[PDB]
Design a protein around this ligand. Structure first.
Ligand SMILES: CC(C)Cn1c(=O)n(C)c(=O)c2nc[nH]c21
Ligand SMILES: CC(C)Cn1c(=O)n(C)c(=O)c2nc[nH]c21
Lengths: 214, 17, 328, 221
């Protein structure tokens, strides 16, 4: 199988920018490559074929180039409607294969996340389980790291992270990080800490609580 | 287009007859 | 449309016809891939000219030109292999056979003229489908003609064109000449039916085998004339690999196109050879065909004329390469 | 316009089978090859194979032999994908697309995709826990409250705050699996002065289990 590699999963852009998306083939595919555009829950669409030919109806701001193993999709003067996922595909030979996609996102001003931590509710505790949740809301850019500490010690296991897509209105991202333990594991400790490191601050944002107070 | 019955398969598998 | 046609005649009936040497049409290894349409027509004129047909039959440059053009426009463009370039590549083979293969010196002027005219029109209006199909699909052409259906049609066409005004390239012949030329032409075109080639070749392969074959014999000759038609009709198989490669790509597509119709309108399964899905069994199918139909014949043709060997050489040379491929 | 319309999302039990449809409008599938491609969460598209609706010929890639079965019908212009002996790994979005039969592989037409979710879990109502902030006397502005919805199957659950009156400031996260059952949280941010003087309740609904739960967030734990 020919591997089509799109090294960039995400790219921040602004309306008016010239944007280029790369795709590398593991074997010589000639110019037998096509590019597709896809938006959430919608059909992919053919944009470029034969590496550099524009498919019927696609606007003249999309062009493609390359051959052999290195290919590039270029959007000149990017428009709002261009924010979407893009993926290359080779049809040099079987099996046909696709790149993993590159998502074009919107650029805005950096914003520091709003962090909040919550202990297990007494109710969940009567159930024998204990989830400690931390929200990291409305930040930009998306690059962020959350660290948990139980009694000042890094906790690797049991945490699940979930992220919302970039907000369609305010262009920020939000995330939830939750540490799930049993009531017994949770009750054998005092200090729980949710720490967020983001480019918006040199001192990570630290939020915590002590079980014996609360 | 009547030929010997032994021939028939080869004849047909090429575009003939 | 009628307009582009008519200027095409102006430009053609006024251009210099280059020499046969210049045009490399004397070669068995010749290719048309890089020629224009106008060029091919020009070669054709050079063909008629250098076979003395033009002078010995009082042909007017004007007329011949119209005629040629007419044949050109009566081959279907949308048809993959059986278009004008096939009729042309055949006639050039035919021409090469008579010259370099040295056969001209073995037959009459009436015969040479007939072979050339036949070679050029042996597939007129071919609609990219074999006799087998048209028969099984009850085409009205099958209701009209009995055996050799398509080949009868190709001739019906050839003749329609020769009777066209300003196309009577034969106008110069005595009524007796004309009368027998047409007879031979009919025989030639029909001979390009593969079924007749098969149902007759055995006879001919023996006279060769038994060192008995002899042109002088009226019948022995006209049989050979059939065999010669076939020889040129599929001369494509005797081309340099890069050419054979590519022309086999067209036959390929045209077949597969028929295969589609077979399961879409006919609701039958196509033979593998026209089964688009089986494209990976091409080379062995090519091998088997070359064995079954070809080598056999070009061998014979060389016993008749040694200088015709390049055909046999190029044939087995491609067989070689298909076989390799068939073994991936 | 030329369009490929696929059937709706399916939540199926492991070991079962499911049959997906892809209907063409504005054009005829006969002279096209209809291909199907799978897309797993956080993964790239993987080709499954194609069918030639004209003759019924199909070609599958080895990973899907005995897994997928493609059929087509040119009179109704519909192609089908049958997936049998389903497992967790078959959970993905499945697309059908089309390209000229004589064409090497350009995909000019694609369906919108069908999400198939495979699991051996039984339908389970969620437990809704209130997320109230501890009594940390440190003086601050805006306050963030939340609700943890845990241990339900299948998706989805919907969550609102104050019956939809509180819409701005809420973040409801994608659900994630925790040993066959789903969990998600929702946060809401309101002015510090408005809570707790004014009630804040999260309304959680889980149509699959015919359950509705309202949790009022009160101070403490
Ligand atoms: C009707 C036919 C015998 C007369 N005749 C003829 O003699 N020559 C020489 C032609 O070229 C020709 N074309 C049509 N009829 C023709
Ligand atoms: C009638 C024609 C398609 C028969 N024919 C042919 O002429 N060439 C040159 C081939 O290579 C070939 N292969 C199968 N049939 C073939």
């Amino acid at each position: 199988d020919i591997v089509m590699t799109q090294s960039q999963k995400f790219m921040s852009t602004s309306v008016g920018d010239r944007v280029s998306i790369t795709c590398k083939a593991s074997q010589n595919v000639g110019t037998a490559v096509a590019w597709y555009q896809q938006k959430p829950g919608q059909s992919p669409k053919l944009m470029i074929y034969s590496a550099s030919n524009r498919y019927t109806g696609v606007p003249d701001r999309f062009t493609g180039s390359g051959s052999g193993t290195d290919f590039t999709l270029t959007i000149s003067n990017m428009q709002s409607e261009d924010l979407a996922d893009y993926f290359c595909q080779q049809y040099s030979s079987y099996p046909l294969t696709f790149g993993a996609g590159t998502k074009l996102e919107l650029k805005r001003a950096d914003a520091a996340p709003t962090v909040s931590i919550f202990p297990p509710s007494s109710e969940q505790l009567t159930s024998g389980g204990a989830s400690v949740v931390c929200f990291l809301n409305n930040f930009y850019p998306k690059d962020i790291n959350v660290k948990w500490k139980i009694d000042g010690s890094e906790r690797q296991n049991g945490v699940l992270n979930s992220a919302t897509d970039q907000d369609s209105k305010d262009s920020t991202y939000s995330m939830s990080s939750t540490l799930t333990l049993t009531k017994d594991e949770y009750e054998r400790h005092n200090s729980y800490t949710c720490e967020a490191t983001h480019k918006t601050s040199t001192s990570p944002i630290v939020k915590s609580f002590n079980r014996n107070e609360c | 287009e009547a030929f010997n019955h032994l021939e028939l398969h080869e004849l047909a598998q090429y575009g003939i007859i | 449309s009628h307009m582009e046609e008519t200027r095409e005649l102006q430009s053609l009936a006024a251009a210099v016809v280059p020499s046969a040497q210049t045009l490399k049409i004397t070669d068995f290894s010749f290719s048309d891939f890089e020629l224009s349409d106008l060029e091919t027509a020009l070669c054709t004129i050079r063909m008629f000219t250098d076979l003395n047909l033009v002078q010995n039959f009082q042909m007017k440059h004007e007329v011949l030109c119209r005629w040629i053009l007419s044949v050109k426009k009566n081959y279907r463009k949308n048809v993959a292999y059986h278009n004008w370039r096939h009729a042309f590549n055949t006639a050039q083979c035919m021409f090469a056979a008579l010259k370099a293969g040295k056969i001209q010196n073995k037959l009459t002027d009436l015969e040479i003229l007939a072979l050339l005219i036949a070679a050029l029109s042996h597939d007129l209006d071919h609609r990219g489908v074999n006799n087998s199909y048209i028969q099984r699909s009850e085409h009205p052409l099958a209701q009209l003609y009995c055996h050799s259906i398509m080949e009868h049609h190709h001739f019906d066409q050839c003749l329609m064109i020769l009777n066209s005004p300003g196309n009577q390239i034969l106008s110069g012949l005595s009524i007796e000449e004309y009368k027998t030329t047409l007879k031979i032409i009919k025989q030639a075109i029909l001979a390009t039916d593969l079924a007749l080639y098969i149902k007759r070749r055995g006879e001919f392969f023996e006279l060769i085998r038994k060192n008995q074959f002899n042109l002088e014999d009226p019948h022995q000759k006209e049989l050979f004339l059939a065999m010669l038609m076939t020889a040129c009709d599929l001369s494509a198989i005797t081309k340099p690999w890069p050419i054979q490669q590519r022309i086999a790509e067209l036959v390929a597509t045209e077949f597969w196109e028929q295969g589609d119709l077979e399961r879409t309108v006919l609701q039958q399964q196509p033979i593998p050879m026209m089964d688009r899905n089986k494209r990976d069994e091409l080379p062995k199918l090519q091998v088997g065909f070359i064995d079954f139909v070809c080598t056999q014949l070009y061998e014979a043709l060389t016993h008749v004329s040694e200088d015709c060997f390049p055909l046999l050489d190029g044939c087995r040379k491609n067989r070689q390469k298909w076989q390799a491929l068939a073994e991936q | 316009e030329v369009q490929l319309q696929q059937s709706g999302a399916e939540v199926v039990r492991s070991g079962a089978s499911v049959k997906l449809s892809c209907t063409a409008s504005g054009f005829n599938i006969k002279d096209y090859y209809i291909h199907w491609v799978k897309q797993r969460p956080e993964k790239g598209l993987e080709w499954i194979g194609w069918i030639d609706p004209e003759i019924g010929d199909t070609e599958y890639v080895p990973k899907f032999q005995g897994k997928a079965t493609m059929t087509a019908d040119t009179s109704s212009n519909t192609a089908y994908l049958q997936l049998s002996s389903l497992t967790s790994e078959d959970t993905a979005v499945y697309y059908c697309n089309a390209g000229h039969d004589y064409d090497r592989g350009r995909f000019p037409y694609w369906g919108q995709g069908t999400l198939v979710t495979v699991s051996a879990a039984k339908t389970t109502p969620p437990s809704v826990y209130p997320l109230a902030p501890g009594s940390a006397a440190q003086t601050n502005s805006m306050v963030t409250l939340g609700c943890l919805v845990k241990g339900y199957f299948p998706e989805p659950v919907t969550v609102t705050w104050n019956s939809g009156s509180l819409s701005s400031g809420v973040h409801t996260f994608p659900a994630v699996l925790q040993s066959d059952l789903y969990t998600l949280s929702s946060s809401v941010t309101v002015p510090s002065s408005t809570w707790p003087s004014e009630t804040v309740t999260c309304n959680v609904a889980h149509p699959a289990s015919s359950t509705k739960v309202d949790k009022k967030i009160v101070p403490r734990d």
